[PDB]
Every structure is written in C-alpha cells, then in structure tokens.
Ligand binder design. Sequence first.
Ligand SMILES: Cc1cc2nc3c(=O)[nH]c(=O)nc-3n(C[C@H](O)[C@H](O)[C@H](O)COP(=O)(O)OP(=O)(O)OC[C@H]3O[C@@H](n4cnc5c(N)ncnc54)[C@H](O)[C@@H]3O)c2cc1C
Ligand SMILES: O=C(O)c1ccc(-c2ccc(Cl)c(Cl)c2)o1
Length: 441
Amino acid sequence: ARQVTIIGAGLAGTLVARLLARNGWQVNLFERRPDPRIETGARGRSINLALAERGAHALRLAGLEREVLAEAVMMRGRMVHVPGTPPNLQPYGRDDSEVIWSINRDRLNRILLDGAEAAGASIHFNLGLDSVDFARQRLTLSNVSGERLEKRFHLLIGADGCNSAVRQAMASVVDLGEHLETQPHGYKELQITPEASAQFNLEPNALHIWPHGDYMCIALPNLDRSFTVTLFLHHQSPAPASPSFAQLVDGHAARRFFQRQFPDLSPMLDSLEQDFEHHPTGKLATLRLTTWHVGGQAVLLGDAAHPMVPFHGQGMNCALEDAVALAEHLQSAADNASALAAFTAQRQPDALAIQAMALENYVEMSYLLERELGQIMAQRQPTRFIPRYSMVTFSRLPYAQAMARGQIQEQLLKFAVANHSDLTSINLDAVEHEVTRCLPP
Ligand SMILES: Cc1cc2nc3c(=O)[nH]c(=O)nc-3n(C[C@H](O)[C@H](O)[C@H](O)COP(=O)(O)OP(=O)(O)OC[C@H]3O[C@@H](n4cnc5c(N)ncnc54)[C@H](O)[C@@H]3O)c2cc1C
Ligand SMILES: O=C(O)c1ccc(-c2ccc(Cl)c(Cl)c2)o1
C-alpha cells in the first residue's frame, strides 16, 4: 500500500486523508492541536464559515455532505445594514436552491476527523512539525513541552495552514517563488448571543454586512441563533486620527467606536469589551507560489499553498476543492512526482484567480449605476449574465473562468454606463445584445 504523511488536521488535511485512506492508502495525519472531539471543561469558541457549492460538492464526493449540511444554516442572501434604513436583502439566487451555508468550523472539523478515521486514516494530535530533512526523508515533531519525535516519511502533504511549517521546510531545498502581499486591514472576531440577535430581529437565514467605507463588519449565523462577527479595520492610521486598531487602545475605546460608527450593531455585542481585548487582531495577506511541490517528496495545498484574504468567503471552499484534486492526481498518476506536478499545474491558475477576485472584493468593499444596470441584465439574461459573487459561489466553474466572464461583464457595464448620469438614458435592449454577443451560455 502507498504511504503518505499529512501535516495539519484542518479542513484540507482531514478531507484529503479520508479520500486517500478510502482508496487504500496508509495515511498518517499529524496535528499540533488537541483532538477537538475530546470534550473538556473549556469553552467552545469557534467561527462560522460560508460553505458554497464547490466546497459542498467536494464533501459530496467524500460522502460527508448530508452530515455537514444537517448542521449548517441556510443563507439566502446578504443583508446590508446602513443606519437609518431597514436591512436590504440581496438574494443570492432565484430560490432556495441557490444558497450558501453557514457551518461552525469546529463542527465541520469533527465531522471530517470522524470521516478520515472511518476511512482508515490514523490521526495523531498534540504533535507539531518542527523541521524536515528531505535528503534523509525524516521529519521532526514535538509537543508543547518540547519533547521531540522523529518519523520517516515517503510522501509529505503540507495542509498546515497559512503559516505552513512544511512550506518553510520546502523553501530550504527549492525556490518556491514566493511573493507576499500584505494588506493594511486587520480583523477582530466578536460574538452575538442568541438572546441579542432575537431581541433585535437579526435575520438568521442571511449573511449580514455593515459597510462603512474603509472599515466594516460581517456576521454569519449559527444553529443556535448566535452570530460570529468580524470587524475589518486598518492596523494603523495614515500619517492620522482616522479609525484604526492602534487608535482603539482598549475595549472601552472599541465600544465608543462601535457606538459611534456601528450604532445598530453595538447593542448586540454584549461582550465587545472583553472580546476586543482577549481576542488577538488578525492579519490579512496574499501569498503566491510559483511551485507547490518538491519533486515527488512533498506538496502543499489549501492555505499552506495560497493564503488569500477572506473576502468572497472562498478559502475553505478552495481548500476542499484542492483536496479532491490532489487525491485524484495521486490516485491515478504514474508516480508521485508526476501527480504533484500535474496537481500544481491544474490548481495553481485557479488559486491565482480566486486570490485576485478576493482582493478585488476586498478593495470594492473598502459605481452605483453599474451595479444597478448589472442587476437588470442578470434578470434579463440568466445563464449568460451571472453576478460575480454568484459564479464563484454557486458553480463549480473554475475560478479562472469565473474571473474571465466577470471582466467581460464588468467592461460591458462600463460601456453602457459611460457618459450617462442616470439609467433612463441607457438603451437596455442594446446592452442585452452585447450580452448575447460576448457571453456564451
Ligand atoms: C476571519 C476569517 C474568516 C474566514 N471566513 C471564510 C468563509 O466564510 N468561507 C470559506 O470558504 N473560507 C473562509 N476563511 C478562510 C478559511 O478559514 C481557510 O482558508 C481554511 O481554513 C483553509 O483550510 P486549511 O486546511 O488549508 O488550513 P487550516 O484550516 O488553517 O488547518 C491547518 C491545520 O494545520 C494545523 N497546523 C498548523 N501548523 C502545524 C504544524 N507545524 N504542525 C502540525 N499541525 C499544524 C493547524 O492546527 C490546523 O489544524 C476565513 C478566514 C479568516 C481568517
Ligand atoms: O457573498 C459574499 O460576498 C460572501 C460569502 C462569504 C463571505 C464572507 C465570509 C466571511 C468573511 Cl470574514 C468575509 Cl470578509 C466574507 O462573503
């Protein structure tokens, strides 16, 4: 039986472990954190993730979809909150068949862990990868107490997240062609209780957004009517008094900021002060690699291979999509080296596409006529004019194809709106003809 060692029992690592063990591979999976299925007295702090069609499809191929969706909340659209006006629901699709799902990360990881073990994988927790000796084909692991263990490996899969230790080790033996692009926004994760969201009638079956120019909040629901809230805000003010994490010296400052800038959201954040001080501020960055593998010895996938900004909510979906593709190449290739090169060749252009579209979404949420004309064109020519957040989300269309069609649609709108102040001056039938001329079904 072919042997593989996977580092990181996250979303990509656990899924690929299941797909490989199900195909007869001897799978050993190492995770630095404890087993989350072992109940302790500690609280369960976990965020919700938006699971889209492409991510759900990957779970379907793994035979885990129904189990996952049973614990997921349906989000029919985005609920945009501008103070003074009732929330405006922008539906994601025609009906409840075009939706995305909010799933708690911890729940998903536990289901994937059970699935990988049911398929025959062996999972070892409380062991973090420290280094790799590629010549001797050995790696070193250690627990938090620093006690070290050495293991032989034949194939090494780096599914160890955006700060992959496997990636660091690979960069020592090959030039991965890394380019790091940091973003000026950080983020802070907050919470809304079930009592609070009910009291203020926050729609459970929707994704919620609080736009505010250079900063904003987003909220995803959970089964118990609580919401996970994420604040996006500049790390630093430009050189000066504009809002930034540096300007919010403590949780009391955060409250004043929210009471001023997010008045309809502050009442729902009961634990704002403590969450703001105890939850660390996250960083945003995009990391692009020219290559994802070292010969036939090691390969990266998920956040280890292509860290991206969380806008568009596609990091997990891409990671699950990576896992299916990697298992497919490994299963059917002439040899591991061929599989890893073919895997890289397939997935690298798609990762670049979603990395770019996520950043574009990041910029766009940090012109009104174009979106208004586009909303009309999407209703008049379905299957040809599909909004950006729908193509990435509701179809297994390769990311690069979603992007290519998005540019055609964006330019088409540019020509129709150019040199017009309002929509009554636009020839709607002429716009529709360009759609049929430049967008195949
Ligand atoms: C605020 C925020 C919100 C997001 N919202 C969404 C969303 O709505 N929808 C979506 O699709 N994506 C979302 N994402 C992106 C998504 O969370 C990641 O892309 C996804 O988790 C990637 O899965 P992964 O398996 O590659 O990495 P991870 O899920 O991070 O798993 C990596 C695993 O490897 C472990 N590990 C790390 N280092 C080591 C080591 N040396 N040794 C052993 N184990 C190690 C870690 O403990 C972890 O278990 C969001 C990201 C952020 C920061
Ligand atoms: O419809 C959308 O544009 C959409 C779907 C999922 C997300 C999402 C989820 C979590 C975070 Cl943190 C962010 Cl920034 C965005 O956005």
